[PDB]
Structure 1
Amino acid sequence: KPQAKDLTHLLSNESKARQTSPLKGIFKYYKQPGITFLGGGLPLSDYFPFEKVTADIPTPSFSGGIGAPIEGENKTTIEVFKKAADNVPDQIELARSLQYGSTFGLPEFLQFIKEHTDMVHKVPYENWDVIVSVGNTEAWDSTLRTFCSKGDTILVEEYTFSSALESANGQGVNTVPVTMDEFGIIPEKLEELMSRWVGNKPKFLYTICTGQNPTGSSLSAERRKQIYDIACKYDFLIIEDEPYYFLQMETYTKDKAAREGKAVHDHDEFLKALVPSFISLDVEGRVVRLDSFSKVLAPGLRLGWIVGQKDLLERYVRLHEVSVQNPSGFSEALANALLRKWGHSGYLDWLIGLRAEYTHKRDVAIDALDQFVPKEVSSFNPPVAGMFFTVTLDASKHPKYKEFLEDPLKVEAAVHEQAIKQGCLLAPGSWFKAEGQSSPPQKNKTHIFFRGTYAAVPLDQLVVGLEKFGKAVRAEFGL
């Protein structure tokens, strides 16, 4: 494959200045006979008070559903002993996985994650790599520290993850909002914004492009292509923060009958149905992907990875060395053991069960919106991916709109309070509104929304909450 473009000009001055420890240049002499190596700081693994760790995990192909009790034939016991000799093959024995080591990641874990990445995403340049993270939260903080200096500008979705904005605000990085419709970023308006751009270009575009938080939108293949062309034309990176990528679902249909027939029935059909990632389009190497186990296995793993071109990933590693250092050896050893026990085939089985479970929740959620929410003042886009749904309301139709000084946010607050009074809580959309100006600034409404999740609660309680939300909209809008 071709080499990626040289994008080291997009690194921050601070990232570029980062150095390896001066004790790197005695590492060669480590574990090399003839030399008694006394120049290091490693504690003795002999004292690590963990002889083995075990977990009980479910068994592919998860035929009883991924939520089935982990018992009987749906229970296998994985074991990571301290010594390599005591392990089945391809494990990270605790004497090494609980020892300081390469900030890039443990070799068995990285090998598995690299194969997964290439199998799904077919990275179309030669010099790509994967490094470990302790989750997309830390990966995001590190991304800002690698590509942004104080006063720099990034592009964000005009509604996005509040935590992502808070990280940007703490590093003094301007978050200029990119206009969305119910299907996400509008490529025409991003092209227009960049065609007129005054002063230093934004360093990158930050996108939760699958199951977007909070809109529940997913960028179509067609919008991803157009946004990619903009990033190549104006020379900025795309950061795809993709913890919800494997919460893609069957397309929603009003027709209940035509649902059981829709499910994917094998691995090659599953992999073909997945929306192309930005990394799959990234012939230039200007995409950095933040991947996580948090929504796939468990948030408490504190384990993810970063996909991108070797020379940009090398700067993240320098930062990792003097910040988070490395993920938990327990997390990385146990994830390695689970993924190798399942193998790629069982991990694919797991992702297919995840797809089936979320497809059903979304079906129940959207059936309930269609049923209970009054259509005269509302709309909804059924999500194709993610844990989130939204309800859009025409605030201008609230009977107190004039008394509220034509302020849509007073209508949002009144519907919020009414929802709580009816015994249901959604997240007001305005809470996710991104604000920012470039330095210097670029030359220079009535619809509100609420974010819900169908991932959290039992589906009987999801229907109870949404009927109550329907009542709250009816009471407030006088229908």
Structure 2
Amino acid sequence: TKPQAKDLTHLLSNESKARQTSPLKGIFKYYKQPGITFLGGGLPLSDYFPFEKVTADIPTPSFSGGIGAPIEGENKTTIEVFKKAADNVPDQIELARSLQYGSTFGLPEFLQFIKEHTDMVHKVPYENWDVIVSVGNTEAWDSTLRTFCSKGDTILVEEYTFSSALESANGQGVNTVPVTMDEFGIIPEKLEELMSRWVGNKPKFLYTICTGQNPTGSSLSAERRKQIYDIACKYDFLIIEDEPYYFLQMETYTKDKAAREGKAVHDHDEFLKALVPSFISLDVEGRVVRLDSFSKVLAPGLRLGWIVGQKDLLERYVRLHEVSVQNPSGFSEALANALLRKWGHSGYLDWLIGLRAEYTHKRDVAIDALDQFVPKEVSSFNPPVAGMFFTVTLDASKHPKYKEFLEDPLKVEAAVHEQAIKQGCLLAPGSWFKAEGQSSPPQKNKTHIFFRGTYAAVPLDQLVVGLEKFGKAVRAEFGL
């Protein structure tokens, strides 16, 4: 048995602490009892639900054909969720129950699978941890800001990060103070330094996309995670790890093409050992909240994820969920439960190992094309170890119009972006992801630009075409 998490209820917003259960909780205990005719509720009867069953056709472990193989023949199984429990295989969420209102924590069969998944991978190192359902990391992030932040509070964000996360914070009047990165992500020394001289109320938390970081394609090393966790403990702020790309971890990139087949993980044990430690895995104090999603693993349209953290903080999310999103789609949760239990933990691991193999190959093709096509006199690139994104860094100070552009790297970025489009390829300008913010009160007191690309969006031949056109655009702009 592990220690208890620290009491962090002092990091909740005043508004989150004041949230209450329904005044009709005070009759729920009679909802079970026979002898009592319960007329005090509002539940419709499952008798009219016009869904006798739902089915899906899904692929079959171990996905020996690759996870993208046609779903047919031996690679097709039909899962069925009937309305009535008696008509179902074991451990299903029958539609009479999954299509009824229920507990906002989530349906028990789904929570059990996703909790086992979480513990097998992350070995959460305090006793009083839990999982609750979300309708994806988008909602879970909105709900995080509502649970831990009042208007005028500060959070720390990666100095280049996800535009939607900043928009969500902006909408709630929460200041996003940027944390300095290098090509490998957050620099722990500058985060420590920032905190050591912090003026005014401390930030409530750090928001990190620590695996396959959007837009940098960086992943924090186990060593940087340890140091950042120590800073969160020393200055007493939470870490919110928004981790939709956790299972897009890949084999380390090598230029030696011949070495690549040999590098693949060979079984479930090698796979689990290869995964970078999560902040939850490090979280002896219970100050980590993890946002997990099926979006990049199964499909975005599930609108289903979960949140990992200490019981007493997750309870405040459940109160908010009751009067905001209520619960995920019963169809998504019943079908996800059916797929995961049909595959089993073994099959889901096979799926995640297939996902690793496919992304590893996409990344090798992307970075081989960067190495080949992009002029090195004015460019650099960090091969990603995780995620769907790659970046190309350019020394804007080498652009032959840099003086004529008033030494403004963003005018070089705009020129390269326009030239790329003229050459027939589009990447996302890095400056579009820049986070800006000041604490209240504010704290006291660059020639390189980059572009974000994805290797997950298009067929791999069109990827190579694209990046050749991007190399040309950089050669045209820099006169090479």
Q: Tell me the matched-pair count.
A: 479
Q: For residue 304 of structure 1, report the CA deviation from its aligned partner.
A: 0.1
Q: Name 1:459's counterpart in structure 2.
A: 460
> 1:206 Cα deviation (Å)?
0.1
State the SS of the aligned residue for 1:284: coil
- Provide the C-alpha distance between the structure 2 equivalents of 1:477 and 1:152, rounded to a whole number of angstroms: 43
Separation (CA, whole Å) in 1 of partners of 2:52 and 2:446? 61
TM-score between the two structures when normalised by the length of structure 1: 1.00
CA distance in 2, matches of 1:42, 1:60: 39
Deviation string for 1:285-330 (max 9, x for gaps)? 0000000000000000000000000000000000000000000000
**1:402-457 per-position Cα deviation (integer Å, ceiling 9, x unaligned):** 11000000000000000000000000000000000000000012000000000010
CA distance in 2, matches of 1:430, 1:267: 40
1:90-122 deviation line (CA, Å, top 9, x unaligned): 000000000000000000000000000000000
Structure 1 Cα separation of the partners of residues 219 and 41 of structure 2: 49
Cα distance, 1:390 vs. partner?
A: 0.2
Q: Deviations over 1:195-254 (max 9, x none)?
A: 000000000000000000000000000000000000000000000000000000000001
Name the CA distance, whole Å, in 1 between partners of 2:476 and 2:236. 50
Deviation of 1:31 after TM superposition, in Å, equals 2.6
SS at structure 2 position matched to 1:90: coil
Q: What SS class does the counterpart of residue 28 from structure 1 fall into?
A: helix
Aligned equivalents of 2:122, 2:390: Cα separation in 1: 26
Counterpart secondary structure, 2:29: coil
1:6, distance to aligned residue in structure 2 (A): 0.1
Q: Deviations over 1:151-206 (max 9, x none)?
A: 00000000000000000000000000000000000000000000000000000000
Distance 2:346 2:284 in 1: 28
| Cα distance in 1 for residues equivalent to 2:243 and 2:271 | 18
Which residue matches 1:281?
Answer: 282
Q: What corresponds to 1:255 in structure 2?
A: 256
Instruction: Provide, for residues 310-362 of structure 1, a one-character-per-residue CA deviation record: whole Å limited to 9, x for no partner.
Output: 00000000000000000000000000000000000000000000000000000
Cα drift, residue 149 of structure 1 = 0.1
Instruction: Say if 2:440 is the partner of 1:443.
Output: no
CA separation in 2, counterparts of 1:268 and 1:354? 16
Residues 12-58 of structure 1: CA deviation (Å, up to 9, x unaligned): 00000000000011110003101000000001110000000000000
Secondary structure, in 3 states, of the residue corresponding to 1:193? helix
Structure 1 residues without counterparts, runs of 5 or longer: none
Q: Note the alpha carbon deviations across 1:363-412, whole angstroms, 9 max, x for none.
A: 00000000000000000000000000000000000000011000000000
Distance 1:33 1:352 in 2: 50
Give the Cα–Cα distance (whole angstroms) in 2 for the partners of residues 41 and 287 of structure 1: 37
Counterpart-to-counterpart distance in 2, 1:231 and 1:89: 43
Question: What SS does the corresponding residue of 2:113 show, helix, strand or coil?
Answer: helix
Q: Offset of 1:128 from its aligned partner?
A: 0.1
Partner of 1:58: 59
CA distance in 1, matches of 2:172, 2:238: 18
Question: Residue 61 of structure 1: SS of its match in structure 2?
Answer: coil
Q: What is the CA–CA distance in structure 2 between the aligned matches of 1:24 and 1:364, rounded to whole Å? A: 57
1:191 aligns with 2:203: no
Q: Does the residue aligned with 1:348 lie in a helix, a strand or coil? A: helix
Q: Which runs of 4+ in 1 moved over 3 A?
A: none
Secondary structure at 2:239's aligned position in 1?
Answer: strand
Whole-Å Cα distance in 1 between the matches of residues 143 and 449 of structure 2?
33
Q: For the residues of structure 2 that align with 1:128 and 1:427, how far apart are their CA atoms?
A: 38
Q: Distance in 2 between matches of 1:24 and 1:47?
A: 26
- What is the distance in 1 between the residues matched to 2:249 and 2:49? 42
CA shift digits 1:239-291 (9 cap, x unpaired): 00000000000000010010000000100110000000000000000000000
Report the counterpart of residue 305 of structure 1 in structure 2.
306
Find the residue that maps to 2:215 and give its secondary structure.
coil
Distance in 2, matches of 1:402 and 1:185, equals 31
Quote the RMSD (CA, aligned, Å): 0.3
Post-superposition CA distance 1:105-152 (Å, at most 9, x none): 000000000000000000000000000000000000000000000000
Q: 2:175, 2:73 → 1: CA distance?
A: 54
- Give, in whole Å, the separation in 1 of the partners of 2:45 and 2:404: 72
1:223-302 maps to which residues of 2 (within 5 A)? Answer: 223-302=224-303
1: distance between equivalents of 2:385 and 2:217?
8
Alignment partners' CA distance in 1, 2:158 and 2:18: 30
Give, in whole Å, the separation in 2 of the partners of 1:25 and 1:250.
54
Q: Give distance in 2, aligned partners of 1:445 and 1:133.
A: 39
**Which whole-Å CA distance do the structure 2 matches of 1:40 and 1:420 have between them?**
60
Q: What residue number does 2:28 align with?
A: 27
- 2:111 aligns to what? 110
| Distance in 1 separating the partners of 2:69 and 2:125 | 38
